[PDB]
Design a protein around this nucleic acid. Structure first.
Ligand code: FES
Ligand SMILES: [K+]
Ligand SMILES: [Mg+2]
Ligand SMILES: [Mg+2]
Ligand SMILES: [Mg+2]
Ligand SMILES: [Mg+2]
Ligand SMILES: [Mg+2]
Ligand SMILES: [Mg+2]
Ligand SMILES: [Mg+2]
Ligand SMILES: [Mg+2]
Ligand SMILES: [Mg+2]
Lengths: 86, 96, 23, 99, 108, 92, 70, 137, 46
RNA sequence: AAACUCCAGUUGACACAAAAUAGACUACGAAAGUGGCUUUAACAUAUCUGAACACACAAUAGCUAAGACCCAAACUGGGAUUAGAUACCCCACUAUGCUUAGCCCUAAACCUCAACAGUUAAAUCAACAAAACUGCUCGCCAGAACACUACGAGCCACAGCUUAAAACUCAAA
């Protein structure tokens, strides 16, 4: 309200590609967490539910990264069998 | 026997990794530095997974940013356009 | 855990609060 | 853990096996194997390392002994009578090149 | 202790700015302060529009006053900075140099 | 709560269908789920809840190309759980 | 081992030798190993100043004709 | 010259011109995309209202207002009423995440106006007013 | 050492006598605290 | 459908409310709790244990006085649905959530792990939870239900809180 306008969350259109500018703006707002914040602020989330959700997402991310690391580490052995037959 | 191994700290121990701001002072008046860790479009403070800073310097940067914002040194809703052409130190790409 | 015991505690307490209200 | 007494040390996070102990252990094992072969006992080599299955089978055939480098089915030793016959003779010595 | 006063003053001409700075430093000294040095950071556009003393400001002069004052002075100075009409925004902080630069061995 | 261990181990129906259809369309309007899904521009025809509320079937319009249809199916099947999580997190 | 310290400093100053290691040879001599042997000989035939030993060992190896790029 | 997504700064002079006018002189189309209705208002750089159109002013009623077609029609009507006042280039400022967020701009483009920049100004409190309770449907 | 450093530093402090001149000089000066950091950890001074 | 149309959009001024992002951090505090900025005070003890009652504290809810009131909202109305709706959905609005001075003293107040010190050796070990134990101290427990009850006592509490039985009954729980 007290800030200068047309600086925040603003994307310029290149060669009349308005759809591309909109999709870039959507990507920016989603990456900065603004979209999920707006969607979550429509109704009040109770503090206990918020803490449970944050813990769940944190542990989900940790577990997913660890499983991805394990799969990538064990993917090296997936080559042609060098001792076929024996 | 002279060839037996001797007790010793690892001489090949590599120096422990450092963050880009380690050993440097973070001041709330240095808006140019604090602007390198905020989103150009929203002014939101980047997390450590993007900035790559350590916990101590991440906290220092956060506190300095809040102090500068509330004391009338830094904008809140966007990054100052004067610092848009500064070196990029954050691991984030909008394909923009 | 005993959910019957907690449900028994709930029924006993609720019945008690009805009695004090009545009398 | 049980391999610790046989480890000379760790060289840049790589364990080194004390070869002085290995010499005595190998001496005892080879003496036992030679004595068992002298008594005409059945000797069975076992190893699931497919890189050396051919070599171990060739060696077993060469020395007139037996080899099992393939998938080990349930009960080959503890149920040998049902799997080979009521009068089968089991090995008198088993040598694991890979345990 | 040692304090730094960050002062955002109204965008005025040189005489009024000098008078305001003199008045601020004089108040500091009256409250028992020993002023070490005065820095000028420049006249610049504010990060946002600031409403003070029934006036809207988009531009302002930034100044730093380093000083040594007793602990009881700071509160009083704040109240004084609240009454000065030529001050858009005054904030007293503990001097950053007094804060110790603890050394780090790196990411554990 | 040791998430490590857990991870390792009718008029009402029509209203709920409409609400879920709107919510799923809004979710697909953005990269909130994933950028790969957003680039596909998936469109939904309807949402049907089973009579016993054991499953939610979202009918998505297919395109003419078959490779694109297969890619869309793969991405949607890989994204379904994340959309469920988002729907409950937003308190829809 | 003691020489490991020297090796570390060598591997930190002159870096890894452009010459490749031949681990099949039981008596392979790397540039770092020759530096170590010269360092120990100098220590046994002189004083104990770690920096001076390093610099004089470098001078001696360059005199022999072994390239050493810092 | 490399294209810059970042809008020109009024202070810093730039060469970007649209029909001879600078960035800060272009009219602004304010779109409010609510959950059940969409509003479009075109204003000048000095905040002089030139055109206004919503889904309700174009005849749509009740749930028909909260659709893409209604927002497109409102955008077309606003574009027509703005072209009748000399508007060609516009800067779009969208507010809200309603169904008419993109359809209103589609209508504006289809009505003859050229979009030079898109801005989002959806109200995001830094945790101010407490929102209503979740529905128990 | 600290006391001597403080004693020599006090010579440049602002007093009631030099307030006019020091205010004027500060008004005719500009201090800059801005500096950027690079990915290599180097300071880029403006 | 009701409701509003002193309505709605842009712009400008404008809180005794709440404190995006940072936080993918795991810190402070005895616990309860604590996540906008500045400043002043300030986080006990160089043996350990030591209380339903002593001395201090204790989320949310609740009771007295005054004040503030954006938003939310038990309750209360209106609209809709339904066989009915004294609920769920929509609108409006209270007590209350806020400040000040007093009370009330309860929570799945839980890491469902009492405080200090020590060990990783034994068959590790009913099971599950959260690897198994040792020394020392305080508190507590001896079938289920009756019973977070009755009576007595204490309490700023008066449909309240703490402590807390017995009779009858059963072979289980
Ligand atoms: S790594 Fe040392 S201060 Fe961050
Ligand atoms: K718990
Ligand atoms: Mg004690
Ligand atoms: Mg007692
Ligand atoms: Mg209380
Ligand atoms: Mg209260
Ligand atoms: Mg708790
Ligand atoms: Mg105790
Ligand atoms: Mg006790
Ligand atoms: Mg009993
Ligand atoms: Mg009682």
């Amino acid at each position: 309200a007290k800030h200068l306008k047309f600086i925040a969350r603003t994307v310029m259109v290149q060669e009349g590609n308005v759809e591309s500018a909109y999709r870039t703006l959507n990507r920016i707002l989603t990456m900065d967490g603004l979209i999920e914040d707006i969607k979550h602020r429509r109704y009040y989330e109770k503090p206990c539910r918020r803490r449970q959700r944050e813990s769940y997402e944190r542990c989900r991310r940790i577990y997913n990264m660890e499983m991805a690391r394990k799969i990538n580490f064990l993917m090296r052995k997936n080559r042609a069998d060098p001792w076929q037959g024996c | 026997n002279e060839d037996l191994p001797i007790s010793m700290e690892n001489p090949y121990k590599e120096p422990l990794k450092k963050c880009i701001l380690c050993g440097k002072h973070v001041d709330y008046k240095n808006v140019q530095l604090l602007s390198q860790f905020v989103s150009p479009f929203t002014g939101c403070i980047y997390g450590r997974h993007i900035t790559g800073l350590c916990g101590k310097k991440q906290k220092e940067i956060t506190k300095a940013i809040k102090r500068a914002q509330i004391m009338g040194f830094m904008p809140v809703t966007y990054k100052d356009p004067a610092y848009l052409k500064d070196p990029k130190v954050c691991n984030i790409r909008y394909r923009e | 855990k005993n959910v019957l015991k907690i449900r028994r505690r709930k029924m006993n307490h609720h019945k008690y609060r009805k009695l004090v209200k009545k009398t | 853990r049980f391999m610790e007494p046989y480890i000379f040390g760790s060289r840049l996070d790589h364990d080194i096996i004390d070869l002085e102990q290995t010499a005595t252990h190998l001496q005892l094992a080879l003496n036992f194997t030679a004595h068992m072969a002298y008594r005409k006992g059945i000797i069975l080599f076992i190893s699931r390392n497919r890189q050396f299955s051919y070599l171990i089978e060739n060696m077993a055939r060469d020395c007139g002994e037996y080899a099992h480098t393939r998938y080990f089915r349930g009960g080959m030793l503890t149920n040998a009578r049902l799997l080979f016959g009521p009068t089968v003779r089991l090995p008198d010595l088993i040598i694991f090149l890979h345990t | 202790p040692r304090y730094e006063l960050a002062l955002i003053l109204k965008a005025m001409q040189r005489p009024e700015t000098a008078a305001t700075l003199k008045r601020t430093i004089e108040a500091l000294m009256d409250r028992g302060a020993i002023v070490r040095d005065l820095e000028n950071l420049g006249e610049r556009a504010l990060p946002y529009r600031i409403s003070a003393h029934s006036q809207q400001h988009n531009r302002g002069g930034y100044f730093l006053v380093d000083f040594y004052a007793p602990t009881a002075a700071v509160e009083s100075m704040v109240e004084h900075l609240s009454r000065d009409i030529d001050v858009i925004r005054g904030n007293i902080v503990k001097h950053p140099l007094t804060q110790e630069l603890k050394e780090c061995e790196g990411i554990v | 709560k040791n998430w490590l261990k857990k991870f390792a181990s009718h008029a009402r129906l029509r209203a709920l269908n409409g609400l879920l259809y709107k919510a799923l369309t809004d979710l697909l309007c953005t990269p909130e789920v994933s950028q790969e899904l957003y680039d596909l521009n998936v469109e939904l025809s309807k949402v049907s809840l089973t009579p016993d509320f054991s499953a939610c079937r979202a009918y998505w319009k297919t395109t003419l190309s078959a490779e694109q249809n297969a890619h869309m199916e793969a991405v949607l099947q890989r994204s379904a759980a994340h959309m469920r999580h988002l729907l409950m997190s937003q308190q829809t | 081992y003691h020489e490991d310290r020297i090796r570390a400093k060598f591997y930190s100053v002159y870096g890894s030798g452009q010459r490749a290691f031949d681990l099949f040879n039981p008596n392979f001599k790397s540039t770092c190993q020759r530096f170590v042997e010269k360092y120990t000989e100098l220590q046994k035939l002189g004083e104990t100043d770690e920096e001076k030993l390093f610099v004089e060992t470098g001078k001696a190896l360059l005199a022999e004709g072994v390239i050493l790029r810092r | 010259t490399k294209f810059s997504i970042y809008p020109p700064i009024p202070g810093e002079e730039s060469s970007l011109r649209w029909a001879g006018k600078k960035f800060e002189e272009i009219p602004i189309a304010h779109i409010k995309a609510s959950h059940n209705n969409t509003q479009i208002q075109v204003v000048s750089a000095s905040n002089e209202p030139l055109a206004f159109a919503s889904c309700g002013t174009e005849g749509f009623r009740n749930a028909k207002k909260g659709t893409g077609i209604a927002a497109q029609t409102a955008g077309i009507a606003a574009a027509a009423r703005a072209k009748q006042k000399g508007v060609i280039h516009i800067r779009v400022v969208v507010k809200g995440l309603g169904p008419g967020r993109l359809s209103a701009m589609h209508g504006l483009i289809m009505g003859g106006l050229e979009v030079i920049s898109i801005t989002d100004n959806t109200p995001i409190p830094h945790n101010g007013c407490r929102p209503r309770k979740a529905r128990k449907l | 050492r600290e006391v001597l450093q403080l004693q020599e530093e006090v010579k440049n402090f602002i007093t009631r006598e030099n307030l006019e001149a020091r205010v004027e000089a500060a008004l005719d000066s500009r201090k800059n605290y801005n500096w950027a950091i690079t990915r290599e950890g180097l300071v880029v001074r403006p």
